[PDB]
Design a protein around this ligand. Structure first.
Ligand code: MG
Ligand code: MG
Ligand code: MG
Ligand code: MG
Ligand code: MG
Ligand code: MG
Ligand code: MG
Ligand code: MG
Ligand code: MG
Ligand code: MG
Ligand code: MG
Ligand code: MG
Ligand code: MG
Ligand code: MG
Ligand code: MG
Ligand code: MG
Ligand code: MG
Ligand code: MG
Ligand code: MG
Ligand code: MG
Ligand code: MG
Ligand code: MG
Lengths: 141, 116, 259, 100
RNA sequence: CGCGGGGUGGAGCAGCCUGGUAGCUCGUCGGGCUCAUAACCCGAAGGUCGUCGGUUCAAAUCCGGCCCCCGCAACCA
RNA sequence: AAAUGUAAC
């Protein structure tokens, strides 16, 4: 699944989840988008489950665009160790997602297909989502 | 490169020295030394520059030598190889061409033995 | 005659050829090398990758064992009739009288079934039992449970450990030994299945029994399955033979088809 | 985008890279659209702004190398199996110090 | 999960620490002795140095991350 | 001070 091919540093501080998205808030490729309504670290497991959910609905046809990428390493200490002795090991990677980001985009597909695929994909994600379609507001960006 | 592109051995009789040219053998050696009237026994160190340019001018115009000769032989082989004749095929696979036996021998064409 | 009724898998897959000496000693091993050269002369005659993966040469030559992987389309379907004991009657390479000795060799033919490496510990079939350990440790052995005791419900293997103090260090060794028996018990039932099959094809009757006999006196290459006798040993025990297996393949259709 | 690309007939998808184009033109001269013939596009062929037939009085304001449309292969469940069993090499860390 | 040792031709080992050349034994191949095999004699072939990297002008070698393997440790309740 | 040669006169 999705993870950086290489990195400068193995482990990354957790940071914060303040505010609306920095960017990526408008539809830029497909006809419909799935927009995040609340902040979270989205795992590559969740991303790929949403993706597979969409292609397995389309069955054959369409095009999916994944606009978030999990580049942030996720760290966890081995089970049953005490505090200290350094930072835990990297167990996975997450994509930081804040309210308003277009996470996925679909094209080449009917409206009802796009509505249904993105809905099922929303059920694979740990946040509330909203389905949107391309607008003049999007094109004007 | 005195004559004719090659620097023929000095201290040697002119007839023998001339054979050190690609395209001139002993036969053509006795030929050019008659038609220029130069003693065949004389050493190349003992030639006159008159005789040198004399022997030079004749030899370089009567027969094809060194580079131009190599160019033709190759083209002659290049043609047989391109027209796809049996003679050509043998040249393309580096095998003997004059109907020689190849179960044994053929070492001059084939090269030293490749173990198996 | 509508040859289009019976079905068979494996016919197109890839086959192992295990040729071994039988009755005869060193001369028998010699003829095991003569047989392999034939399956190598013929596997080239349809363009089949014949790999050699195990063998044991005879002292005077040939092969005491020789095991090969013959790859290509239709490998097993062509060669499945070569399994058994092939008999020879010839003047050995080890006798100066010229007395004739009757030896035999054996051939195994197995199609490869997408081999192995597949199972891995999935939880729906595991009931894990936790409780308190047994022995020294003080009031901690008394209170903290920490003795993991797993039970693999489909296979029945129960490996159960109490060595390190934490049940999670104990969980690790419990899982890491269940696999060592889930794999051990499957690899047995597959190699127990590999010796029940092979023992039948080769047949202990390698004195003189099953398939073919090759006359070197008069050249009568015969297959006792049907009867068909011929003199093609020159053309068969020195090359391919894809056409002289055809009656053994054709008479084996009408064997199944007509009944 | 006038026409149905033949790649679309073969199962593909027309990715509409640009849905408009940047242009210098007079206000008295504003066209309503610019038609583009995409029916010739296979999987996966592309059109650029150089291929645009411009109406009179309108001048391209982007580089003609700018790509404007493409016909891409579709999503396919048949590929899911290889993608799920595709093993990924773990990320390499870029070396610092006496390693670089 | 700690600690410290290893992976180098087909098999078994050396080469590292003081970087530039990969060697030893058996084995494999071709030739001889013998009626023939072994043994013996002659000659020859054979290595991504576990990987992913890069240090250095230069890595089997030095230095990191990973994948295996070997030994030890895992105590006071 | 140097081994072996099975199995159909
Ligand atoms: Mg923090
Ligand atoms: Mg999380
Ligand atoms: Mg963390
Ligand atoms: Mg603890
Ligand atoms: Mg504590
Ligand atoms: Mg810590
Ligand atoms: Mg941690
Ligand atoms: Mg994770
Ligand atoms: Mg975001
Ligand atoms: Mg949700
Ligand atoms: Mg912008
Ligand atoms: Mg000459
Ligand atoms: Mg055996
Ligand atoms: Mg007790
Ligand atoms: Mg106590
Ligand atoms: Mg307790
Ligand atoms: Mg040693
Ligand atoms: Mg060692
Ligand atoms: Mg030898
Ligand atoms: Mg290393
Ligand atoms: Mg080196
Ligand atoms: Mg004590």
């Amino acid at each position: 699944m999705l993870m950086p091919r290489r990195m400068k540093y193995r482990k990354q501080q957790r940071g914060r989840l303040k505010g609306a998205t920095k960017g990526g808030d408008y539809v830029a490729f497909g006809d419909y988008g799935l927009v995040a309504l609340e902040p979270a670290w989205i795992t590559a497991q969740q991303i790929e489950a949403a993706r597979v959910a969409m292609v397995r609905h389309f069955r054959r046809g369409g095009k999916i665009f994944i606009r978030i990428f999990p580049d942030k390493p996720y760290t966890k200490k081995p089970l049953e160790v005490r505090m200290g002795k350094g930072k835990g090991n990297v167990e996975g990677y997450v994509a930081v997602v804040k309210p308003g980001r277009v996470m996925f985009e679909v094209a080449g597909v009917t409206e009802e297909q796009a509505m249904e695929a993105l809905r099922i994909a929303g059920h694979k994600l740990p946040i509330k989502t909203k389905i949107v379609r391309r607008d003049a507001y999007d094109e004007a960006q | 490169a005195r004559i004719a592109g090659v620097e023929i051995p000095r201290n040697k009789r002119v007839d023998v020295a001339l054979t050190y040219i690609y395209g001139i053998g002993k036969a053509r050696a006795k030929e050019a030394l008659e038609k220029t009237g130069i003693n065949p026994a004389t050493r190349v160190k003992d030639l006159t520059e008159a005789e040198v340019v004399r022997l030079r001018e004749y030899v370089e115009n009567t027969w094809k030598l060194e580079g131009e000769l190599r160019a033709e032989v190759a083209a002659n082989i290049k043609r047989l190889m391109d027209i796809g004749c049996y003679r050509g095929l043998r040249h393309r696979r580096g095998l003997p061409v004059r109907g020689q036996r190849t179960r044994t021998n053929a070492r001059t064409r084939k090269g030293p033995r490749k173990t198996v | 005659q509508v040859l289009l009724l019976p079905k068979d898998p494996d016919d197109e897959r890839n086959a192992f050829l295990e040729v071994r000496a039988g009755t005869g000693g060193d001369e028998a091993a010699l003829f095991a090398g003569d047989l392999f050269r034939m399956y190598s002369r013929y596997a080239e005659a349809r363009r089949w990758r014949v790999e050699i993966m195990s063998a044991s040469e005879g002292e005077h030559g040939g092969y005491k064992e020789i095991i090969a992987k013959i790859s290509g389309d239709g490998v097993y379907g062509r060669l499945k009739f070569e399994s058994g004991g092939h008999r020879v009657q010839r003047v050995p390479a080890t006798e100066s009288q010229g007395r004739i000795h009757t030896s035999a060799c054996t051939v195994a033919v197995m199609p490869e079934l997408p081999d192995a490496e597949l199972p891995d510990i999935n939880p729906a079939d595991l009931r894990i039992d936790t409780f308190r350990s047994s022995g020294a440790g003080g009031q901690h052995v008394n209170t903290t449970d920490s003795a993991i005791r797993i039970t693999h419900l489909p296979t029945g293997i129960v490996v159960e450990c109490q060595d390190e103090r934490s049940q999670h260090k104990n969980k690790a060794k419990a899982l890491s030994v269940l696999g060592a028996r889930i794999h051990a018990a499957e690899m047995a039932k597959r190699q127990q299945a590999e010796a029940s099959t092979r023992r039948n094809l080769l047949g202990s009757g390698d004195r003189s029994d099953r398939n073919r006999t090759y006359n070197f006196p008069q050249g009568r290459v015969t297959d006792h399955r049907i009867n068909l006798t011929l003199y093609r040993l020159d053309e068969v025990m020195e090359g391919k033979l894809d056409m002289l297996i055809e009656p053994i393949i054709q008479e084996h259709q009408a064997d199944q088809l007509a009944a | 985008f006038v026409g149905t690309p033949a790649g679309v007939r073969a199962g593909g998808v027309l990715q509409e890279i640009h849905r408009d184009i940047l242009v210098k033109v007079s206000p008295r001269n504003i066209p309503e659209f610019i038609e583009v013939d995409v029916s010739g596009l296979e999987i996966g062929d592309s059109l650029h702004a150089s291929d645009l037939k411009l109406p009179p009085g309108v001048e391209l304001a982007v580089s003609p190398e700018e790509t404007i449309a493409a016909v891409v292969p579709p999503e396919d469940v048949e590929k899911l199996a290889e993608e799920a069993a595709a093993e990924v090499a773990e990320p390499e860390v870029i070396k610092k110090g006496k390693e670089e």
